[PDB]
């Protein structure tokens, strides 16, 4: 409606002010994260049964819970793990878009009623149902180096003085704790248990009932007697605080009046709760936190508030504690936002420069300077209206749509300057005629492109949330540009531009002689157009040939500033050997990378193959990007050089790796293939079925590579069977045997107590040196029925036998999660098919099931051409609606293979992959080439019937007058991202993925596709 | 009204009453389903050979295909027209009389000799200086 | 005796049940076929 | 039931009130614990 | 109560901005709403 706004410019300014004021009001109110919610919601039931193994947890806690996880809405699958430390880990994955609070409350209420079925120790330890959110925002570690304290003193200073206050700030969530807080530990000693004639059952029974409450009522209790004057509460016996009070419990008094106490048959030593995880920071002990960003707070000021709250606790530290940050991916977010903002601002500066270079007037070269940023502000307002945030995805959505942003001002201002320069009109009537020439064309552009992107918004899975960000950001920005293009720019071309009619004039002469030479060449090649048609056939066949031979992937790997190093020791290695290997790793990183590596935070018993004691992980954080210049100092070189330098450790699997986004790695190659056991076959026969399925995938190297089992193999275990007749003939109860064995050799968790205000736990267990060999079971005596001490091995035996350190279940049936990846060259559509054709010759009862990242590749994983198949005909119908003809859209939509040649050539030459930035850049390049091909033929169509010209004459007349816009807006764009292409700094993985496609594709779509559309239009108007 | 919010509120008021119910009710497990009132469909599992009785078919349906149908999205409650297996012990009062026993010593012996005992690790944490072994102690398993 | 959850659609629930039964059907013992008695689902589909 | 209004504050009140950070709106949260035995937290969210 | 003490000048400012813009949008001038957005104190002294 531009003629309403030519006569009314102030109303155009008013709606420009409300859209620019509603944009800037919504930039102060929307989140700034790094990536949005990208994974389907998944809740996690986690429980522990102390002292058990994988088998005991796997059929007292695991199978008991997952028989009662029924009737939960929108559930896809469920996978569980039970390992030898006692831990059970159940993950329920839900549909995309399922409300996570409702899902967690339904899972936790179905678990609240399956609670009396569980054992007693699991109910005391507690079962935790919590939602599995993203990974760590930041890790706040803390050390002590000026002096010496243990790990537990640091962890208790954190658990009593930081976690209470760090979680009380603007925008935090789950706060973990790498250490372990206090517990009144009791170290039993079996020789004094022998000589005083006691058992650990007597110890646990003696200190159950020492610290407990008394519901004692009150003096003057109600009902009172007539005349009562006094009222006060009885405060009876309470808990026990100090360790001497825990040492002064009477056990047994003898005939001679002897006093047996806990400090005679034990030692107290207040100490730590869990002794499996030992954190480490550069060679001194440490502790840490686990801060998660919650839902809708920006991570920048969140991390600033965390650093501020740690910054006001240094006056309160015990003379030597120091806070240090071994994992921080917050300044990388700040870099990845600042570079995109700088690219937008320098693109506006470059279009100012190009407009003044081609038009030579200061007064009309700033219509894009006013009219382009208001669309970006309106785009931020629409992004906040949908509820989306400042991701990396929306930022790199507005940085490659800036051509579509900036064309809808260049076209208008060039066309009104052309009308003033040729026919010689005042700016008002010239703007009327100019915006009447391109009236319906811009509405046709808004209909014809809105259909190129919006099928990208309707995929499914975890990659239908990556595409939706681009496919609503670019749609909103373009559909607001087309509104502001016929409202704001006509008013600005009617008011600002000068009515005055008419020596650096070399560029003008060069441009006019290039224009005349162009028109002569195009008029030459509109006769005998067969060679250019067969050249177009060679172009489209070359497009298909280079499109097949190009590796597909996801989001590029880049320098987040940190990387991990994983350590695993073979099959039952202790904690000390893993500490020696971790110290070798620390001594490597702090000597051979003096000028690259800043801090290595070494955690023991933590590794990603599962919990345990023969594993370890190491968070290595480097220096700043400005401090390590070069190509040989980025993470991609340090990782392979450390992995090459970690092959000389004789017995340790140690390797370094980077961080992709969170989880959906394998760049488009992995499997997640569950081998399920849908009968009563068991575990050893399922292991034989897996061992048959492996080494049949090794028979096909051309299709399959790196098929690793993802699961721990069988380790020896120490079976001790209680002989029944010897136990009951000698008169020894089996319950006292089992509560001696499973309380001297594991924790027992008697009860709680109160220390310094807080509430801690009390564990009983034997010493560290009476439970370390198979020859230490003979030091444990148990009372019989009469009172005679009976030893172990008087009623038992001892064998070593193979067990299992980890037991996996999938949808309630036993399974083994075989991982793999496809070979180079072949996709994962003909690799998963070979897995399904290869898992069908297994023995009877063993089935297969896909899970994880491949699960939503089975549920309609071939609906990518099925949506552009209905995008293409909507494009065809809009173009047949515009020109009032059929087969004119055939003349305008044969420019789709023109902008693909340059993008595929640049991706092949530079060495890129078919990631999502390449696809979105290809999908904008073809749309912009279609936009140019629409405008040239809209001039040619409304020049040979409104005037009466011929066919060749009107065609070269139309391509004459539509040459000054096209290279003006390519030169302001295949130049507004040149730096992004040559960028090598922090976060140049996404920047090069954006830059290389939209450089080569744009150059090819403007060099070639100004010579084919006269040929296409003439060939169409010959053969209808 | 909202259905799942209603189930959450009814569950909230029920879990406040769970400690007052007897132990024999809690061990069977109470359940809160948002079912409709009645049967959408029933399935049927005949035997054409004649190798299985009623109890075999009921145990197969209870063990291998009830717990997956009952997790299917859109199913409120699944009734079973059979019974799962259970190690059923039919006692004889004359033989408990002859050997001077009661049905209390039977339940005590089954609780005592059909246990699943957690028994620690023999290379456990915290280790001594110079520990080279780590494995698990396996005391006794549930009977099969 | 499969009942129905509150508010669920009775046609793509029964489709999900018949999809679950075609997944655990090749693992039946020798001679055990599943048969379909009482069902209120196909009447809605035939009437529409 | 076995209360003295300081055991309740330090063992069953400061725990819950310590573990109520992560809820979205909140506004303010007023708790009280008395020597009778009972205790209650009151979390007052934002309007709307 | 103190919340309503902290959002009243923001309310007055945003209402004067939206009325200035809705009059400049409809009378096609920036000088006519400037002769209307200073008759406001003549009413506000009356209310006060
Ligand atoms: C929700 C809105 C639904 C609108 C659907 C289209 C119905 C309105 C179309 C009416 C229309 O054709 O208006 C023309 C404006 O062109 C246009 O530009 C129409 C713009 C369509 C909406 C774009 C925002 C008249 O223009 P005219 O008669 O003055 O032509 C003189 C040229 N010299
Ligand atoms: C979203 C915008 C949809 C507006 C749909 C109006 C489509 C249209 O072309 O109507 C024009 C009215 O101008 C307008 O509607 C301008 C107001 C745009 C508000 C946004 C015709 O404009 P006209 O020149 O035929 O009638 C002027 C008589 N005074
Ligand atoms: C002719 C001139 C008008 C051109 C209109 C072209 C049509 C563009 C929209 C096509 C509608 C298709 C559609 O709704 O799909 C959605 C497109 O995003 C969108 O919804 C984009 C809608 C455009 C909103 C901005 C339009 C300008 C209005 C004025 C803005 C002023 C702001 C400051 C006051 C995304 O699919 P989905 O939404 O279903 O999936 C995400 C759920 N999370
Ligand atoms: C899921 C589909 C949603 C509809 C489709 C989205 C496309 C909208 C196309 C029309 C464009 C309208 C743009 C005007 C809205 C400007 C909003 C700026 C202020 C703002 O961001 O606040 C938001 C208001 O959302 C609002 O609700 C403002 C009204 C938006 C209208 C559509 C809803 C969030 O509220 P808040 O963050 O301020 O609340 C917490 C208090 N601090
Ligand atoms: C191009 C190559 C030179 C770039 C040099 C870096 C300039 C960065 C200045 C921008 C800045 O730091 O503050 C921004 C405000 O801009 C402002 O307040 C600008 C006000 C005018 C100051 C002009 C003097 C700047 C000196 C450098 C000249 C180059 C300017 C290039 C922008 C806010 O940061 P944000 O909004 O971008 O997002 C921040 C998300 N982490
Ligand atoms: C031409 C195509 C026009 C199609 C318009 C479709 C707009 C989508 C409607 C929509 O879902 O937005 C909701 C309401 O927005 C709104 O209600 C604000 C937009 C109002 C403009 C549409 C009515 C104009 C009538 C002419 C979101 O709103 P919500 O998510 O906050 O939930 C509020 C529930 N009560
Ligand atoms: C929800 C449904 C609400 C309606 C959907 C949005 C309707 C937008 C239609 C925009 C067309 C406006 C229009 O016809 O004005 C002409 C556009 O020119 C053109 O000729 C543009 C034609 C290309 C657009 C084709 C759109 C077809 C689909 C229409 C919406 C159907 C959606 C139904 C779900 C002005 O130019 P002019 O009047 O001077 O024409 C002389 C050509 N020389
Ligand atoms: C564009 C069109 C023109 C719009 C210009 C913006 C007008 C904004 C009105 C400001 C009203 C503020 C009244 C107020 O409560 O301020 C208090 C003290 O200031 C005072 O004492 C101010 C006393 C005088 C204002 C009271 C009259 C009620 C509003 C009528 C405004 C009419 C203006 C007509 C030109 C609090 O102080 P603070 O810390 O919030 O700082 C902001 C002070 N301005
Ligand atoms: C910002 C909010 C602005 C709301 C007020 C808009 C009023 C439109 C301006 C207006 O009415 O101009 C009249 C045109 O009316 C007409 O006869 C043409 C129709 C104008 C329709 C305007 C539609 C208003 C809705 C726009 C909302 C968009 C703002 C929010 C994004 C004057 O012309 P005249 O008839 O007196 O003299 C013509 C002699 N040739
Ligand atoms: C950015 C705000 C600009 C204010 C409007 C400029 C003056 C309008 C020109 C109208 C000419 C009649
Ligand atoms: C982001 C800046 C918003 C500015 C909108 C007000 C324009 C005043 C002229
Ligand atoms: C962290 C805030 C990011 C805001 C980016 C604004 C970009 C505006 C570009 C248009 C004005 C030049
Ligand atoms: C973003 C807006 C900056 C202010 C530009 C307003 C220019 C108005 C000129 C009016 C005609 C001379
Ligand atoms: C002599 C070969 C070049 C043919 C003319 C090319 C015209 C297109 C480029 C116009 C800008 C220089
Ligand atoms: C996208 C495929 C649509 C096919 C329609 C072609 C119709 C051409 C008719 C030509 C008659 C002049």
Tab-separated table of C-alpha atoms in Angstrom, chain A residues 163-164 167-168 172 213-215 235 239 295 754 757 759, chain D residues 1-4 7 10-11 14-15 18 21-22 24 35:
chain	number	residue	atom	x	y	z
A	163	UNK	CA	25.899	-24.112	48.079
A	164	UNK	CA	23.403	-22.430	50.409
A	167	UNK	CA	21.918	-21.346	44.556
A	168	UNK	CA	20.205	-18.206	45.947
A	172	UNK	CA	20.653	-20.946	38.664
A	213	UNK	CA	13.893	-37.791	69.868
A	214	UNK	CA	11.251	-38.017	72.602
A	215	UNK	CA	7.735	-36.689	72.022
A	235	UNK	CA	12.839	-30.869	76.445
A	239	UNK	CA	21.155	-36.140	69.674
A	295	UNK	CA	15.218	-21.889	31.875
A	754	UNK	CA	23.431	-32.912	64.339
A	757	UNK	CA	23.631	-26.919	63.201
A	759	UNK	CA	22.441	-32.778	59.945
D	1	UNK	CA	6.745	-34.363	67.336
D	2	UNK	CA	9.930	-34.227	69.408
D	3	UNK	CA	10.494	-30.528	68.832
D	4	UNK	CA	12.112	-27.560	70.529
D	7	UNK	CA	15.924	-28.852	65.902
D	10	UNK	CA	18.073	-26.634	61.680
D	11	UNK	CA	17.143	-30.132	60.473
D	14	UNK	CA	16.631	-25.106	56.556
D	15	UNK	CA	16.923	-28.231	54.382
D	18	UNK	CA	17.680	-24.440	51.169
D	21	UNK	CA	15.815	-22.400	44.471
D	22	UNK	CA	15.096	-23.166	40.844
D	24	UNK	CA	10.594	-19.923	38.365
D	35	UNK	CA	7.918	-25.831	69.418
